Design a protein around this ligand. Structure first.
Ligand code: NAD
Ligand code: NAD
Lengths: 427, 425
């Protein structure tokens, strides 16, 4: 952090990321509040976590009990005497009931208001700690199995760069994977743009979690793609995702390798022909659309509609912060990455009725060749302009994607999660 | 200072409203394809120079784009003409409500537009601004309910609203007698109006025809009197958090305005910043009570006893902090997300009743609160596309737009007045 003097900014925390064998949080877990979540959750986490009843690993507050704005006082009552004790890379999650679904307008106002609390708290925490808000459907049964994959993602090292975000967990029940630490056991994952970078690390994490990976890139990058296939022990596929025949060239690979079925599609491939719109030609427009928006919609509609992905399937699309907040010289790119959010939102109901979920991850600043291609000052500021005072890592994005891919994450669809470390920029 | 230099800023002096001056710096060019271009050309022919010099405004009808391949339309219209956009020009893309699209393709493409407008917002020079307006595909072809939004955007009134998303329903609209005296004959209750923003909300309302009930607390007596005097309104002392609050306002409306008021403004707000780990009951409770409990109490109360009925308008004051959070403001932002909460929650019910409810989230606004040290003041001032802080008028204008009798199809809305501040969710 070489400009910490210039921008009056703290040294960053070394963010704790996932290691097999290590406990999920580094302290004890406090589950307070009142409502229909405190007891179930206390119950679901007894064994894997360290429930009070030193230093707090986690702080979960149950806001579902708060049915009017006057109840909000509780956030205060619970949080104030404990923040003093939140350990390194601690985890604070408020859980509320879906505001549009609330039993009163009064209730709805209190639950909506929660975001202001969580995102503000995100900005006060220290030494690597992060906040999250999670809404749960009031039609969720009292055990709330559908909430588990989400709580377990946040209440761990994996959500290391997920900060100040809002998760929406629907009403369906869920079944734990056989092994929370091998959640994608015997799953078939297609990962486009897997030669290098984020796509590659998706593959790695997927494979670490138990999945068989189909690593797609173009022939130009086969070598790095061979290197990825090897390392996850998956299979390569040389393919332009924009080609008429692409959907067919994937189903056939599935037919020769995987009984013709897949469980997970990750639309990760992308390109960035940047330029100001005043100076934008047709070719720099079209390419970006083709790769970035036209293809993922087609691979999604294609593979589902040809039966390659069916019940229990998962589709995670790679959005971007530019897609939400906009970015100078990226009217093409930000249109595609906004469209990506379109696909997630537009397709979710139809796919829901097919037992398929779809979500998007919007990465923030991530160390990659591409951030490495930005002028160093502009680059360094960018790297530092977030609650967590540093740039993300490709693992941090893959994690978010692997939380979505989870078989227990079935109650979570239509979600867009930023992996930005609570970057200051946004809509 | 080095980083200043290294990074590359030339703030345009922003053009604001002035009785008499054209609403644009040049001709309006309305293009694209779909259900909005023809009606808009006809609605706007009188007061605007349509392109049958340089571009005062550009409006692109995107409602005709039904698939992502069609997005390229945006590029074919804007690329060629952008170079000719003037000082404080306006760019507006009109689309169909994505959730209400006739296909998922359409939904994708239409949702995608915000990427475009927010980004373009960030490219425009000379203090020009971009906006996205979504129109219910259920609006009649006439598109009467859109006009008030098009006039507010396509004017200097909207000088500090940039990069925003406006969402317009299906309902038909009647235009005011006089677009320049929009609130003529209206009675507005503006709370927190002794100083700054509220005080300015009272002026703008006067300028537009309203009889203003300027409200404040006892301590503020002196500055209230000045407001009420300046705007030809009448003054009311009360603390909005009093149990008799609704009753006292109601007593006033009988004595002075036939029991009726048309618009309620929950402007009254206060801070009390403290890190949450040093937050006490008083600092929590005071803010909650003034900023969230009160505004609701007033609205529900004032609709519920009939003081504000059919044609009514409640505009509430959010804040970017309630959108993006902010250090030392768990209490404050809880309440201003609360305000959005009030807005989104009371909207269906208030619609069924003939009342629209909307919110405004100011950015950084030159005011007496903003007593913030130079270090911080300087960067919040400059961290938006317009490269400067905003004036109270810029906010009150936005509020006046909502408040128009012609803004009936506009409800549910939260609009930031931030000159597209970088900070958000
Ligand atoms: N900071 C970041 O690097 C960052 C931040 C936000 C979002 N993203 C997004 O995340 C995704 C991965 O990030 P990245 O920077 O590694 O992207 P990238 O530009 O490096 O592209 C990823 C891979 O996809 C491949 N690809 C391009 N066109 C293809 C096509 N026609 N068919 C098959 N493969 C194709 C490329 O060869 C490349 O190896 C991208 O969609 C990007 O837009 C990245
Ligand atoms: N000033 C900004 O840059 C900005 C930014 C974000 C949000 N806002 C919001 O806009 C509003 C206006 O604030 P401002 O910046 O002009 O500062 P301000 O405090 O001067 O204006 C608030 C007014 O409300 C009055 N007030 C306070 N409590 C009251 C009560 N109990 N009953 C009646 N009146 C009461 C005060 O007397 C004052 O006149 C606030 O709600 C604020 O949260 C302003």
């Amino acid at each position: 952090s070489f400009l910490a003097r210039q921008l009056g900014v703290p040294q960053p925390e070394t963010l704790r990321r996932y290691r097999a064998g290590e406990p999920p949080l580094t302290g004890s877990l406090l589950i307070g509040g009142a409502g229909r979540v405190v007891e179930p959750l206390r119950a679901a986490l007894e064994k894997d976590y360290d429930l009070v009843g030193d230093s707090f690993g986690g702080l979960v507050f149950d806001a579902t009990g708060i049915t009017e704005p006057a109840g909000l006082k509780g956030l205060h009552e619970f949080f104030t005497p404990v923040l003093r004790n939140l350990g390194r890379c601690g985890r604070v999650v408020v859980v509320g009931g879906t505001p549009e679904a609330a039993a009163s307008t009064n209730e709805r106002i209190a639950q909506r208001a929660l975001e202001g609390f969580t995102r503000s708290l995100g900005k006060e925490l220290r030494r690597g700690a992060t906040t999250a808000l999670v809404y749960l459907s009031p039609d969720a049964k009292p055990a709330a199995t559908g909430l588990e994959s989400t709580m377990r993602f946040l209440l761990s090292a994996k959500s290391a760069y997920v900060d100040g975000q809002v998760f929406s967990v629907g009403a369906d029940d869920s079944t734990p994977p056989a092994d929370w630490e091998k959640p994608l056991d015997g799953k078939v994952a297609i990962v486009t743009g897997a030669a290098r970078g984020i796509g590659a690390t998706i593959a790695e994490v997927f494979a670490r979690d138990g999945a068989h990976v189909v690593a797609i890139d173009v022939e130009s990058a086969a070598e790095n793609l061979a290197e990825t296939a090897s390392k996850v022990g998956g299979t390569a596929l040389w393919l332009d995702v924009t080609a008429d025949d692409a959907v067919d060239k994937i189903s056939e690979h599935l037919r020769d390798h995987h009984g013709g079925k897949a469980d997970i599609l990750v639309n990760n491939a992308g390109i960035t022909r940047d330029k100001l719109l005043a100076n934008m030609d047709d070719a720099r427009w079209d390419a970006v659309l083709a790769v970035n928006l036209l293809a993922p919609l087609r691979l999604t509609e294609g593979l589902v509609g040809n039966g390659s992905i069916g019940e229990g399937g998962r589709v995670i699309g790679l959005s971007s912060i530019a897609g939400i907040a906009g970015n100078r010289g990226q009217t093409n790119y930000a249109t595609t990455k906004a469209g990506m959010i379109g696909i997630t939102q537009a397709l979710a109901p139809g796919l829901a009725a097919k037992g398929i979920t779809i979500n998007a991850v919007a990465p923030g600043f991530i160390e990659t060749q591409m951030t490495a291609a930005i002028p160093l000052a502009t680059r360094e500021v960018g790297r530092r302009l977030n609650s967590l005072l540093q740039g993300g890592q490709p693992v941090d994005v893959a994690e978010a994607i692997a939380y979505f891919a989870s078989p227990a994450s079935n109650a979570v669809t239509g979600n867009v999660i930023r992996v930005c470390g609570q970057a200051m920029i946004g809509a």
